[PDB]
Design a protein around this ligand. Sequence first.
Ligand SMILES: NC(=O)c1ccc[n+]([C@@H]2O[C@H](COP(=O)([O-])OP(=O)(O)OC[C@H]3O[C@@H](n4cnc5c(N)ncnc54)[C@H](OP(=O)(O)O)[C@@H]3O)[C@@H](O)[C@H]2O)c1
Ligand SMILES: NC(=O)c1ccc[n+]([C@@H]2O[C@H](COP(=O)([O-])OP(=O)(O)OC[C@H]3O[C@@H](n4cnc5c(N)ncnc54)[C@H](OP(=O)(O)O)[C@@H]3O)[C@@H](O)[C@H]2O)c1
Ligand SMILES: NC(=O)c1ccc[n+]([C@@H]2O[C@H](COP(=O)([O-])OP(=O)(O)OC[C@H]3O[C@@H](n4cnc5c(N)ncnc54)[C@H](OP(=O)(O)O)[C@@H]3O)[C@@H](O)[C@H]2O)c1
Ligand SMILES: NC(=O)c1ccc[n+]([C@@H]2O[C@H](COP(=O)([O-])OP(=O)(O)OC[C@H]3O[C@@H](n4cnc5c(N)ncnc54)[C@H](OP(=O)(O)O)[C@@H]3O)[C@@H](O)[C@H]2O)c1
Ligand SMILES: COc1ccc2c(c1)c(CC(=O)O)c(C)n2C(=O)c1ccc(Cl)cc1
Ligand SMILES: COc1ccc2c(c1)c(CC(=O)O)c(C)n2C(=O)c1ccc(Cl)cc1
Ligand SMILES: COc1ccc2c(c1)c(CC(=O)O)c(C)n2C(=O)c1ccc(Cl)cc1
Ligand SMILES: COc1ccc2c(c1)c(CC(=O)O)c(C)n2C(=O)c1ccc(Cl)cc1
Lengths: 329, 329, 329, 328
Amino acid sequence: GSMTKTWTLKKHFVGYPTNSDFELKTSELPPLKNGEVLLEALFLTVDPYMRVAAKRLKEGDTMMGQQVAKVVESKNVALPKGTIVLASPGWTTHSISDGKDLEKLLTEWPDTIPLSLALGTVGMPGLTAYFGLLEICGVKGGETVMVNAAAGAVGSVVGQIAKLKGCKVVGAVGSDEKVAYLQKLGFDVVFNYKTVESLEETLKKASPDGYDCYFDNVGGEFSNTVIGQMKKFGRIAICGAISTYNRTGPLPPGPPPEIVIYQELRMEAFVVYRWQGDARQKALKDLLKWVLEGKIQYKEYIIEGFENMPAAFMGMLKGDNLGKTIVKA
Amino acid sequence: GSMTKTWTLKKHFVGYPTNSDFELKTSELPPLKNGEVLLEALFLTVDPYMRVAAKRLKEGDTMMGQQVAKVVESKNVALPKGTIVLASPGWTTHSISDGKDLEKLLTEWPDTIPLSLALGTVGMPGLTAYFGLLEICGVKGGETVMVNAAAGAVGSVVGQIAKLKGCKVVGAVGSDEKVAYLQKLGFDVVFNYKTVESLEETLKKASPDGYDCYFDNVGGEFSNTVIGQMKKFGRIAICGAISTYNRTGPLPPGPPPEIVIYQELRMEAFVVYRWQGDARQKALKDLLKWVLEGKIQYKEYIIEGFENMPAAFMGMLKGDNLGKTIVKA
Amino acid sequence: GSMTKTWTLKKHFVGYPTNSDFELKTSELPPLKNGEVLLEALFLTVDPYMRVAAKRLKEGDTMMGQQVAKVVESKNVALPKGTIVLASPGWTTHSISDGKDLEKLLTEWPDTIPLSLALGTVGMPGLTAYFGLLEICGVKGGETVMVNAAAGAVGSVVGQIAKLKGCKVVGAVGSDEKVAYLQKLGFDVVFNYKTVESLEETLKKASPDGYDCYFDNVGGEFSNTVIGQMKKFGRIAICGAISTYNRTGPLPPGPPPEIVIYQELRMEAFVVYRWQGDARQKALKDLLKWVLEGKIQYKEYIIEGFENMPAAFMGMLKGDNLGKTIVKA
Amino acid sequence: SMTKTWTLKKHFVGYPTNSDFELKTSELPPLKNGEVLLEALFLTVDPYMRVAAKRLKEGDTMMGQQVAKVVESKNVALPKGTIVLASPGWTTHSISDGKDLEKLLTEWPDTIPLSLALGTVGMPGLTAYFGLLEICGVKGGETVMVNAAAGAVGSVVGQIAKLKGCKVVGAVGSDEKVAYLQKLGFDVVFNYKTVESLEETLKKASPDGYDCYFDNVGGEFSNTVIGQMKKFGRIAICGAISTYNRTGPLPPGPPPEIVIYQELRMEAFVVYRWQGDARQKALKDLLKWVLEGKIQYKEYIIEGFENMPAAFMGMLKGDNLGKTIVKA
Ligand SMILES: NC(=O)c1ccc[n+]([C@@H]2O[C@H](COP(=O)([O-])OP(=O)(O)OC[C@H]3O[C@@H](n4cnc5c(N)ncnc54)[C@H](OP(=O)(O)O)[C@@H]3O)[C@@H](O)[C@H]2O)c1
Ligand SMILES: NC(=O)c1ccc[n+]([C@@H]2O[C@H](COP(=O)([O-])OP(=O)(O)OC[C@H]3O[C@@H](n4cnc5c(N)ncnc54)[C@H](OP(=O)(O)O)[C@@H]3O)[C@@H](O)[C@H]2O)c1
Ligand SMILES: NC(=O)c1ccc[n+]([C@@H]2O[C@H](COP(=O)([O-])OP(=O)(O)OC[C@H]3O[C@@H](n4cnc5c(N)ncnc54)[C@H](OP(=O)(O)O)[C@@H]3O)[C@@H](O)[C@H]2O)c1
Ligand SMILES: NC(=O)c1ccc[n+]([C@@H]2O[C@H](COP(=O)([O-])OP(=O)(O)OC[C@H]3O[C@@H](n4cnc5c(N)ncnc54)[C@H](OP(=O)(O)O)[C@@H]3O)[C@@H](O)[C@H]2O)c1
Ligand SMILES: COc1ccc2c(c1)c(CC(=O)O)c(C)n2C(=O)c1ccc(Cl)cc1
Ligand SMILES: COc1ccc2c(c1)c(CC(=O)O)c(C)n2C(=O)c1ccc(Cl)cc1
Ligand SMILES: COc1ccc2c(c1)c(CC(=O)O)c(C)n2C(=O)c1ccc(Cl)cc1
Ligand SMILES: COc1ccc2c(c1)c(CC(=O)O)c(C)n2C(=O)c1ccc(Cl)cc1
């Protein structure tokens, strides 16, 4: 009896996604069964991983993704109308759930921050920065950390956790606007990797001593240069490689194995969902407390309208976003 | 006084080394001074690293390398005539030393094994396999381990230590004679990577479940294929990358970061000389005991004549060697 | 005074252009000076060369390009109101010109054909096909000509001029619709290069004798295969290499010089603007006359709306266009 | 009669190695009508053999040309003592029927070595002659880039360019070769192996660019040269020796943006395209220029048929200054 809107993949991406690769559909959801609830999207997220996972989708399928939603119709006594939850039905305005696949927000979640932070700094990207930096990289204080995409959802949290842990932070971003923003946040050195005369010279001057840690979101040639300036036994958290997600040809060369061996680098990739239970719960509480204390400032790149969700995904891949990209329903 | 012969790098290598890139030179060493000794090479080693480190030499320099030598003339009572030592004067038949840079063999070294094992299984390559497998890969027992160059000095020791730790071993070699030899040693699966119809399908049949560990001596496209079949949380010891040492053009593409990230691989490069003191002495003794007890079989590829040292170096780069490549003086 | 709209390059392209790389800007043009005129764009062209030339622009500059325009205000007696001219002010709807850089259409230009053909078959792309085939390739009749992008502006004119000169034409295109269209036109063989089981096998069956001429618009691996089937002393007109314009990494391998040398191939690149004066005028008249006689059928891929000019440029790079891509103001 | 023959034991992997060749001694049959027995005096080794050996079956004889003399004859047109060019491969003695033999120039004097018939006054000299004068189309005054400029073909290219009034920028692989070509008078000569940047070196050697490019090397080297060709510049694609011994994929191709913008003309060629009167005219011109001192000849002589594999391998690695020749 209820209607919904859903973004589906009409055509597989070639290079960057385009508007014609998506198709909006209006359908009628089935009636609720006993124990089910109807969820209305309040905020939806778009994330770089969707560019990679989309290739395993079939044409006509719904784009994957998480959202903050509220119950608008309930046949479940535990989930009354008004309940806020995180759910991953994909790019859709309304969806059916039985309760098992839903996640309530932290009990201490205050009204002083937008619910949309549950998809960002106090959500999956913030957890990625938390464990990638503190556990994979293992910063203990005083290290020099290189982080790229430093003005995005993950990188901005990485740099600010590093600063509050007593580290020096060198950040790479793709616009002068992002450089200014992170400078205001207090990052030690920030530069626009698109306009540097020499990426090697820039990284050398940013830290003549080398780099203890590298939180890598970009991959590709950029990371080959960073590897040449890691300290011996330096540590790389392989978080992402967004410079390759939209590639049409072969991957770029790897770093010269001469340098990798001499540098005896430890390089570990990770997926945020590895951490669950009490470890995950504790990381969310730390992130919430740091936001409320101002040690982590949040900024959101809000795109208004479900109909503009493809445009938000496409823009984020191209760096339009300063901070977590969010679609307000 | 005494005469000597020395192999020098006449020209920097372009692709594989050739005879024209080396020049034998005969010089007269000065008489011995107080505290000096004259060393006569008994066995000299050639190793893949020399292909890469030679680029940092100047044309005319002596090729670098280690050797087992004996004192044949002494003005140093602490190093009497007949003393056996390890020394790294380069590709030379005779050399003068004062003692500081000389390393005696293990005191328990028996006459039942060749002195040349101090350059191989009970030497630098054996230590490389030892720490690369037990620490960097961190084998606990029961893992499925992929080792390439599995019939070489390091790789053959890797597979044999893995077998006595209870691991399944999948070895890749370059000739049918190497396939047969390692099968007789007991390696679970061994194949000739040069003649298999498809490296990917071969690795899948050798272990449909994937690979817990990857001892990587080869790098390049081969490692790209192995990475597509690593188990989640799989560990890679980046030991060498010999598939690139003789390249004329750019490095090959890197591994797909999509697989590296989702499988959350740990990948650490290492240099054998990192381990010193009691850990190194303890590893040498473990290797020596394993040899005498038959747990580690040794095979040497002996090339006779100092004048054939370039041919041994080139042949080993071409895969001629079954076991440690050694030049008998 | 008069208002105008201008497409600017907001960001340098990384891979394929995206909407985020362009910015529409509204300006107020200054008053006309004596001898100047105000031009209103009727049709604008987008062309592959713009993907490569944009690299030399500064961010904020106007995208380069040609257009058919009409004088809407004149202080120039030679250019009264209503005059149609070709002009190259870039991607702009209104512009000021002093007349020197303007080109009137052929005096015999009839009302029976679209004005936009002055940007295509009876314009710059038609001149590229004309001189590239008749002069650089030097077809005299009876040759077998391989042309790729055979359904684009240049390639479609190449194949049709080749057919009317008595040549056999083998065309490569990127869709089955383009295969069907060119087969109907009378091209001897046409195939979809994206779906062939083996590019070499397809080209061998299309002409077991080889290829006398190769009009190359694509470059890359495709041309490596074509070179492997050129007749001895075959001629290649290097017109474009669009398969590399949107690359993120290094160029692909070159053709095997063993084949290029033994086949003694003649390869000459050219720019259409080399030909001027009477030679250029003669070609324009030939192209118009062939169009009016039906020997050259024209097709246009029309995108309506100046605001959709970036989308027409991007679509053409992705093969959306059958025939010359044109933006109707 | 007995003979000695070098055969391809194993197909090459990278550069040829000593083990890839096998010397075989066989007994030739007696002569029939019109047949002669040839004794090799000089044999040539050439870069093309590295590539043509890929079409051989293992056990076959290595291909190649040689100067030979008739030591036994049943052909009146070819008496004992006659000098001829023959291509029986790497063999000390061979039987021929006369059809495939070529007499030397009739005016060939005793003042020059016979072995020049395999070099400056032979196939490599003809390659430089037609490659430069026809494919590059030198008329005089051009700035000419020639690599392998101290080899058989490249040294003749640079000297024909000098006598036509051209500026010559030559690339070689040793300081000895740099000194030899600087002494000959080449305008600019550099060791491409020791420059820190090939682009900088070519930029300063000719800030104006290059009118012509005689290409013996190919690969990355030629990608750099293409970025410095003047508009409408001409490239003679003679060889690509930097790729003959490759084990992996070819390097990237030249940047098409530059090739199109500069409207470059690039034509490959094989020396045997020219025959009859055009070939004869070139041979005469080359002999005249050698006798007049305009083309100096230098040979890299390796003595002994048994060292022919070593001469072929060394030439591929740049040991040779001038044409590599094996003295039987
Ligand atoms: N391992 C995990 O579990 C995990 C979880 C979440 C995210 N990730 C990864 O972390 C990265 C960041 O994700 P996010 O959610 O925070 O997105 P984000 O950084 O907010 O947005 C993507 C950003 O990447 C940059 N970018 C795009 N193309 C680029 C290129 N070619 N070179 C360099 N930078 C480029 C752009 O910023 P500039 O203007 O600075 O270029 C853009 O703003 C992605 O690689 C993603 O896959 C991993
Ligand atoms: N990091 C360290 O401390 C350290 C120390 C010592 C050695 N290493 C490295 O460990 C590796 C083994 O060294 P080693 O002394 O034991 O040499 P080795 O394996 O005894 O000899 C090299 C072997 O590599 C193989 N090979 C050559 N080219 C190859 C290619 N393109 N692809 C695949 N395999 C190829 C050949 O065997 P096939 O018949 O299987 O091709 C050859 O026998 C080298 O990469 C070396 O640099 C590292
Ligand atoms: N030298 C000169 O003076 C001159 C002048 C004008 C144009 N040109 C060149 O000539 C070519 C054609 O230009 P045009 O104006 O006629 O454009 P066009 O062919 O009308 O449009 C470009 C076409 O190229 C094809 N294409 C795109 N990406 C490709 C790829 N990766 N591989 C193969 N084909 C691809 C697409 O058709 P498919 O469906 O077949 O992919 C597309 O329709 C371009 O290379 C251009 O630079 C040269
Ligand atoms: N008809 C034809 O098209 C034709 C006929 C004959 C020869 N050729 C070609 O012309 C070239 C020269 O032949 P040639 O008979 O005169 O031989 P050559 O130049 O006397 O000997 C080959 C020379 O090439 C150089 N070389 C080797 N490897 C190299 C590399 N990787 N990069 C750059 N230079 C390298 C060496 O000199 P450096 O010390 O300067 O490196 C070596 O001396 C070859 O490419 C051959 O195939 C073509
Ligand atoms: C990846 O290319 C190289 C280049 C140089 C290398 C190595 C590898 C390795 C490791 C290997 O791959 O064997 C070593 C050990 N190299 C040395 O220069 C060296 C030699 C002796 C000492 Cl004491 C210290 C360092
Ligand atoms: C670049 O190669 C990939 C491919 C797939 C990936 C990721 C990275 C990452 C990590 C990232 O880069 O954000 C994630 C999370 N991928 C998922 O498929 C996924 C999607 C939804 C869920 Cl619930 C769980 C997993
Ligand atoms: C680089 O790949 C090759 C392959 C074959 C080649 C050549 C080059 C060259 C030129 C060179 O590079 O020297 C020649 C002359 N090839 C011959 O097969 C040949 C032999 C005899 C005659 Cl009559 C005609 C041609
Ligand atoms: C792929 O590398 C390039 C880069 C720039 C190019 C071209 C090709 C071509 C040819 C082509 O289309 O391939 C042209 C014409 N370029 C121009 O910049 C240009 C010059 C003058 C005018 Cl009036 C208009 C455009």
